[PDB]
Ligand binder design. Sequence first.
Ligand code: F43
Ligand SMILES: C[C@@H](OP(=O)(O)O)[C@H](NC(=O)CCCCCCS)C(=O)O
Ligand SMILES: O=S(=O)(O)CCS
Ligand SMILES: O=S(=O)(O)CCS
Ligand SMILES: [Cl-]
Ligand SMILES: [Mg+2]
Ligand SMILES: [Mg+2]
Ligand SMILES: [Mg+2]
Ligand SMILES: [Mg+2]
Ligand SMILES: [Mg+2]
Ligand SMILES: [Mg+2]
Ligand SMILES: [Mg+2]
Ligand SMILES: [Mg+2]
Ligand SMILES: [Mg+2]
Ligand SMILES: [Mg+2]
Ligand SMILES: [Mg+2]
Ligand SMILES: [Mg+2]
Ligand SMILES: [Mg+2]
Ligand SMILES: [Mg+2]
Ligand code: NA
Ligand code: NA
Ligand code: NA
Ligand code: NA
Ligand code: NA
Ligand code: NA
Ligand code: NA
Ligand code: NA
Ligand code: NA
Ligand SMILES: [Zn+2]
Lengths: 548, 548, 247, 442, 110
Amino acid sequence: ADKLFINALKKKFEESPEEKKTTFYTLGGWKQSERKTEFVNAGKEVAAKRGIPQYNPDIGTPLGQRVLMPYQVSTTDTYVEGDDLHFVNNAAMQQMWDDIRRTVIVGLNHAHAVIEKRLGKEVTPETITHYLETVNHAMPGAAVVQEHMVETHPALVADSYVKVFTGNDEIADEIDPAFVIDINKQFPEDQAETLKAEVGDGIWQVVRIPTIVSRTCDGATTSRWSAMQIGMSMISAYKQAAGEAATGDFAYAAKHAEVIHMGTYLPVRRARGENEPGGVPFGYLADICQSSRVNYEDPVRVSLDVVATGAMLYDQIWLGSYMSGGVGFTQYATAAYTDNILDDFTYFGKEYVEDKYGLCEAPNNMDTVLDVATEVTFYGLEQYEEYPALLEDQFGGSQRAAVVAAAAGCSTAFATGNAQTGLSGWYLSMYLHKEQHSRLGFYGYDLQDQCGASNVFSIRGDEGLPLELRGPNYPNYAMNVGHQGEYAGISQAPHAARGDAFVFNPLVKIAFADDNLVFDFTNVRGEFAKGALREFEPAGERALITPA
Amino acid sequence: ADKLFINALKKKFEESPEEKKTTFYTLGGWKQSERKTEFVNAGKEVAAKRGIPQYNPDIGTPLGQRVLMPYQVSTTDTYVEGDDLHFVNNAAMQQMWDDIRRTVIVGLNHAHAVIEKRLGKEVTPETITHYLETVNHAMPGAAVVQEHMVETHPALVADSYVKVFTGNDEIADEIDPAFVIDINKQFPEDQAETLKAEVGDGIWQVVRIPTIVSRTCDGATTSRWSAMQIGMSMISAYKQAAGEAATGDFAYAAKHAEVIHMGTYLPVRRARGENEPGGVPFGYLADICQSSRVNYEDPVRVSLDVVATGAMLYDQIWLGSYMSGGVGFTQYATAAYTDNILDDFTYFGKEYVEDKYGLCEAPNNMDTVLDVATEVTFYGLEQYEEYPALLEDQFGGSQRAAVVAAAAGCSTAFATGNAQTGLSGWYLSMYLHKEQHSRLGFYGYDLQDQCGASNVFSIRGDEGLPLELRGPNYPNYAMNVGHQGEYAGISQAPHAARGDAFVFNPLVKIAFADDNLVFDFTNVRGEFAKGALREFEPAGERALITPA
Amino acid sequence: AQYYPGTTKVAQNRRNFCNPEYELEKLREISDEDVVKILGHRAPGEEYPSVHPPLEEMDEPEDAIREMVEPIDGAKAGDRVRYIQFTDSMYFAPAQPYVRSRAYLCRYRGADAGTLSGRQIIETRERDLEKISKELLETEFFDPARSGVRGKSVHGHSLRLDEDGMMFDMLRRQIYNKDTGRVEMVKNQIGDELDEPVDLGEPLDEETLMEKTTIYRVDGEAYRDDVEAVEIMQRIHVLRSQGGFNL
Amino acid sequence: AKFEDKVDLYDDRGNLVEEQVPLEALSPLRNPAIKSIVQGIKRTVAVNLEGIENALKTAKVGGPACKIMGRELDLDIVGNAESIAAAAKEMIQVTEDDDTNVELLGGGKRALVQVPSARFDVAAEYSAAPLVTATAFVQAIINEFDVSMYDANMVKAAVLGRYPQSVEYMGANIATMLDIPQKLEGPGYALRNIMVNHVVAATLKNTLQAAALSTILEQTAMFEMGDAVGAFERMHLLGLAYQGMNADNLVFDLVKANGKEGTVGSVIADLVERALEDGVIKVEKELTDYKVYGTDDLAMWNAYAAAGLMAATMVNQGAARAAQGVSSTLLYYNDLIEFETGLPSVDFGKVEGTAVGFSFFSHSIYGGGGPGIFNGNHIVTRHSKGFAIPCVAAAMALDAGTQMFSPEATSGLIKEVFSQVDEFREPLKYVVEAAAEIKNEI
Amino acid sequence: KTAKVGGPACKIMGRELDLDIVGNAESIAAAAKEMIQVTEDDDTNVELLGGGKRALVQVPSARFDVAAEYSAAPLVTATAFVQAIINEFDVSMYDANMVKAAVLGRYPQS
Ligand code: F43
Ligand SMILES: C[C@@H](OP(=O)(O)O)[C@H](NC(=O)CCCCCCS)C(=O)O
Ligand SMILES: O=S(=O)(O)CCS
Ligand SMILES: O=S(=O)(O)CCS
Ligand SMILES: [Cl-]
Ligand SMILES: [Mg+2]
Ligand SMILES: [Mg+2]
Ligand SMILES: [Mg+2]
Ligand SMILES: [Mg+2]
Ligand SMILES: [Mg+2]
Ligand SMILES: [Mg+2]
Ligand SMILES: [Mg+2]
Ligand SMILES: [Mg+2]
Ligand SMILES: [Mg+2]
Ligand SMILES: [Mg+2]
Ligand SMILES: [Mg+2]
Ligand SMILES: [Mg+2]
Ligand SMILES: [Mg+2]
Ligand SMILES: [Mg+2]
Ligand code: NA
Ligand code: NA
Ligand code: NA
Ligand code: NA
Ligand code: NA
Ligand code: NA
Ligand code: NA
Ligand code: NA
Ligand code: NA
Ligand SMILES: [Zn+2]
């Protein structure tokens, strides 16, 4: 019956969502808001304590001449003021990033070959389990060889550990299950078969370093820290000299030859090492999100969970802090994961496709792009025109451009089963939207949008790439809000419609299928809500080593 | 009378410090230690809660077959186990790095020229004050122009603010004093006069972004976050259009033309952006440390406070985590700031120099290097030979090498008044030490040491540089413990002997003379002791937004 | 060759360890099997593992250097490269870390030597390692109280001695027998128990340790008092310094 | 005629080829064969056509373990290699008569490509080689099979990998000896960022040719970096000649005299004797039963000492047929020769220092690896200005199979393609010949 | 003369060196050109401008024919001028590192 966003609009405003007029200016300004009132009071306290003015509602212009709205976290019944979705104020969002940043995947295949071929020693499921006991003591920062070592406090580093996975069920069954990511438990049968076949007899470690270290340091720490403690545990468990020539082979394997970073390093203007947000390709972000293994009968839900994951990380933390800062970009991102708005538009498109072509059954060509992206764009824009409350909700043109094009591009990919025609549909949506309303986004929103159509199918050096391989360092995408997380969703979309177990890297997909993570990647939007309510318990806090 | 380290030796061991024999093996292993006992219990709790084994004292070899020693933090009466000096376990150490990482210095000279010449508006102390009130609301993450902004919680970002300084006393007096770092209050008269002359009529901002943000993100965030909120505050306070062509001049000034980063970006193998430890030159580190403005009649104390600053940051955090990780490098660093050992050797050397030459009165040549570095090296090494307890305390050759050569190098620079001959004395020390004991440090300790003599006075492209300009990215120095913090000390040494107000950048010196910092840079070793005792309260915690 | 400057007993002992024509004093007899046991790389009677085929089974490139340089026997056979590692007490052990690495590359072919403060290692092909290790264990390179064979957990070079005059060992590989005055090796170099301990003989007495040591100390012969040795080190510093600036 | 020095030049069998060659005839700035080698390394690319085909058929593109389900494309690339390569060459070349070379290898599985010199004459650097080659092959494949607009982006990913999302060509199926300019440790370092294994591969494990190629690259970089300008030029030239080109047969003769039974220390003794015999060093002072040596020509002493260092490596690592100990030889050759003589070691301690760190980072947990993964641009091994890495190349050439990360493991594509180029495979021959040809122009 | 080397607002007190470089620009430039050129009368150019306050330098083409890239230009120029200034005033080994810092800055730390 109702569009999916109607309940949220009725919560925000006294008027029915269709009504065109309202009342302004008599709401009390900031005084209408519980959260702004909290902030006013805290600012006075802070300024007095430190002897320097801080938050003051009388500086600049007076917030709250209109309704300061609640937001529904999409797929939840949780309604919060938008400040509770700012990454600074939301521990769930900070932990989501920490859990990615502090992860690396490191093979044991080369390592086991060094042991067998260079050292002449045996590797068995028993020696692997012994090694895994050893590395789970050492990885958080504790000693195995030298006398008079000082160590990290176990409780400060409780979130760091090492697990393994392999496609060989019989071998997996022989390793203590405390250390194993069980692919057959975590994934539905057809997905498990695909993932096991991709891994084969390879054995891979998923290493998580301590959040407290990641926060003190940076993402490029992760693979170094991992390798040091892998190295020590190989010495201890396999009876090497503690520092012989073979020890260097384990180092080079763990740091270079068999490591999978979450993010690659960035060029000098935006200089950063590995495991920073800009290095994480869109296909990896889709695979980090675990919606695919729990919501696989609903491709829209899978795709929009990916969009939530990426809009928060890429717009709020990455573009809104690493690349800028200040108040930042909360609502540029919340547009993609609140009020069930993107959900309504994308369900529309999925239904359109299902009825016309069947999922994955449309021709992979421009005719399909023109059909589906145009239809879905016109639907979404019509909703802003029919529901003035919707338009006042997603008040910035950029937000609207992102949401409408995300639906258009995901729907096109649902039709073709191919992310590249989904991307073409995203750009067509932009062009149509711009002409319809004689506006699109902010001053710089459509840099990538105007380069977009020509670069979708280019094959040139710094232009051509399948969408799955693109990321925040693809040149056209390196600067602007309201695109990156949506592109992760479009990358996910054809794979979700196809029922594929992963989008770009099966190892990354399996690595986040782990109940010992702090953040729950199977329910990203639920976790955002939990953090907004101040109900999420992050790792990395220093309470144990500070005064009461 | 007694050597300065005698009391610490007598606290550690039952035997007199000169006794050659002891008793091992019957101490209970880890059970002798309160801290290790805490860790064993915590590891049981962690493993039980998460379902994966973690800290276990019986993995590997059994710690505590010898005495697990307390360490005296030098210049204090505080004795702690070494684990309490691990940066993970020490909130003072973490906050020291955060306070550096989250700081940038940003001129207002170009900005004020844009206002006067391009906008045609006046800049006065009153307009500067109004801008400072505005940017102290905005910088922590709060809005000044747009409607319907969501903001950071003021109490989470209470540590973020902007101050200014200028060499012009009369202008400084006209800006509201809540915002001014008062050079005449913070520095002794002669130092103040030097600093004011270097700054002149220039007006500089010291910007500190939120510790919670620095921890979530990275160092390269700092100057961006800074610039965004400077930009907003220039719009609000000087009545620009909110985004006109002139707005871009302010951006470029704050991000490029008049910014001073703490650290410069690093090459790809060790890829990192600005404001990471490897980018911080040794002369900046000396200037960050504030011992110079409080302990200026004691050049030893000033130099060794800089060594403590640098040994912790460069060895424990940078080399021991950013560049490696795991248990890391606590004791490679503590050797330089515990038990009053380095202090004994360096006071010896300063006394030798004062009596033979007078401080800063020796010829700046190789004769003075040979004399002073040889004498001080032989004194330090004799102490290890005369006191078996001292040798068992600084048990690793690298520790001894760094301590003895730091005393030799600082003393040579106290004689010459020039950091370069100090550096030559450091290398000579290493060569003598190696021949005396037929050992020096760990496998890779003297890479830089053997290149060292030849590269002190070289002028070639990637070889030649005054020591003050060198840092952790100088090629020879990029990898190894036991040198970088000591080099910061040697860079400080001649300037402390001379009475100079700064070593390499007067703006950096002034920027850390600020009582609103969290960490007390005037008493680095006292702060490390406070953190070891679990008495330091850091910024950046999330207690307010998590369950109680 | 002259090896090392200086006029002390220490300097002469450093020269003697380097000089392959100097016959090292043999202090103890150790069986072939017991060398294998201490090393811990293979069991007595186990065939040597290989890392590549024998050189006569491979087609090498035509190469005058290969023709001129005779491979050691373990290279001909394709043996693993394995190690032996020693720790030397600063309380007057006969050999010390740099003295070992310098001597090893004067005396032994095909050697990878590494020096650290608390450990010193040689790596070479396994069957050649066994031959070298006999000499390292039986001669004045080794004292069973002041030196230890240790492939891990090396702490002790800088520690006080125990009541028997033995260096600390976290893993207690070498045990002094109060009833004989002799030391037994009870574990291999990585710390695994031996079936049957190996007799290492009596520790050297204080006078003999002083005669044989290669460490300089104030309570023996101090380095600062070997003025010719010091002069040469200072000369090298000065010449390196000048050379880096100009020639 | 800047310098008076002359050297005698030999071949890799120890036979005299040309006597009395002016030192500057071996300079990178003068010698036309060094120019040819450097310009050849800038312009040569290996193409793995089999790899491109397999990446496309499986949709395994963009880096380790990566795959895009549903994107597979089954194209007969190897079977149509002659047509594809000819089409690529038409795009690569500037004119029909230029120095473009495109040669199929391995029945069409591989191609050797040398992009024309004219492209580099109007380029800032060397990345035109991989980038022109990659787009020519991408376009030739697309045109061969009429790959659609919708699918052609997969061909691009199979050829050049995840670039430009990654800074490097991550997952590419092309290779060069050089690496991208962003990875330089300093300006002027590009000729140093050539893995030792790649040099050993290109030279087919011929020890003296590997040493020569490495020395030519390292010393040529020293010119680009400005290290070999003014005061230090002669020192660098003499090091190229004596360490890398077997000048005066000094390396070869030291090896011959010490190869049957010798050690590092016996090589040192022979080198010191030879330097005394030749008047390069002389007794300066007598201590107590100890001779202090001096010299009036530090650059020549350094060159003699560097020849000895190379011979010590060949003797020590040659005897083991195992490369790992090169880090030890580089350390203790230098440590021992300073206490033998009272004179500074090679590169005034910088070889010794490089060797300390190299030893650590080839025997520890912290980084590095085996000898073959190092190079003059590696943070561990950049410190000596050309005097250390050529010994590492000699040692890896002599390794009989002890290394996990061997040239077979790291450098197979490089081996197949770059060893085809005569001046890369046998550079000593060409440099000696060119020096002889220009001897009267100096 | 001010010891202001190594980046914005940087200074090393006690390291000042009072050298009349502009007054001796012709000698210094000639000496630098001898090091920059490969052969006499090649395409090296070194031209003083602004009364000796500035110099135009064109590093010989032969250096780039055997180079990977273009950094030989600043690096060769910098070292030639460093060496020429040291030689002009007989700057001591102890002080010459300041000349290097004045020409090329904080490289290689930056
Ligand atoms: C396995 C290695 C080789 C390698 O790459 N790194 C090691 C081990 C590593 C581990 C040891 C942790 C553990 O026991 O699990 C850590 C803590 C680095 C990490 N992964 O966190 C470390 N070394 Ni080490 N390492 C040290 C040291 C040293 C000294 C110890 C000599 C002695 O007589 O005890 C020697 C080098 C030397 O001989 O000079 C040394 C060797 C070694 N170092 C030998 C093991 C030695 C042994 O078998 O006992 N370290 C030191 O000299 C003091 C500082 C100390 C470091 C920890 C701290 O700073 O608190 C630690 C620093
Ligand atoms: C050498 C290099 O490692 P790679 O050879 O590149 O793996 C480098 N590590 C280090 O320099 C480690 C320094 C800290 C640990 C050793 C301290 S002595 C780095 O990770 O970039
Ligand atoms: O107004 S601008 O488009 O420049 C910035 C939008 S946040
Ligand atoms: O033993 S090593 O010198 O490699 C490492 C010392 S922490
Ligand atoms: Cl010369
Ligand atoms: Mg109503
Ligand atoms: Mg109404
Ligand atoms: Mg096995
Ligand atoms: Mg479990
Ligand atoms: Mg269990
Ligand atoms: Mg007034
Ligand atoms: Mg006195
Ligand atoms: Mg016998
Ligand atoms: Mg027996
Ligand atoms: Mg031949
Ligand atoms: Mg066919
Ligand atoms: Mg032709
Ligand atoms: Mg076509
Ligand atoms: Mg001989
Ligand atoms: Na309502
Ligand atoms: Na209506
Ligand atoms: Na306001
Ligand atoms: Na930048
Ligand atoms: Na607390
Ligand atoms: Na006592
Ligand atoms: Na243990
Ligand atoms: Na790296
Ligand atoms: Na000319
Ligand atoms: Zn961080």
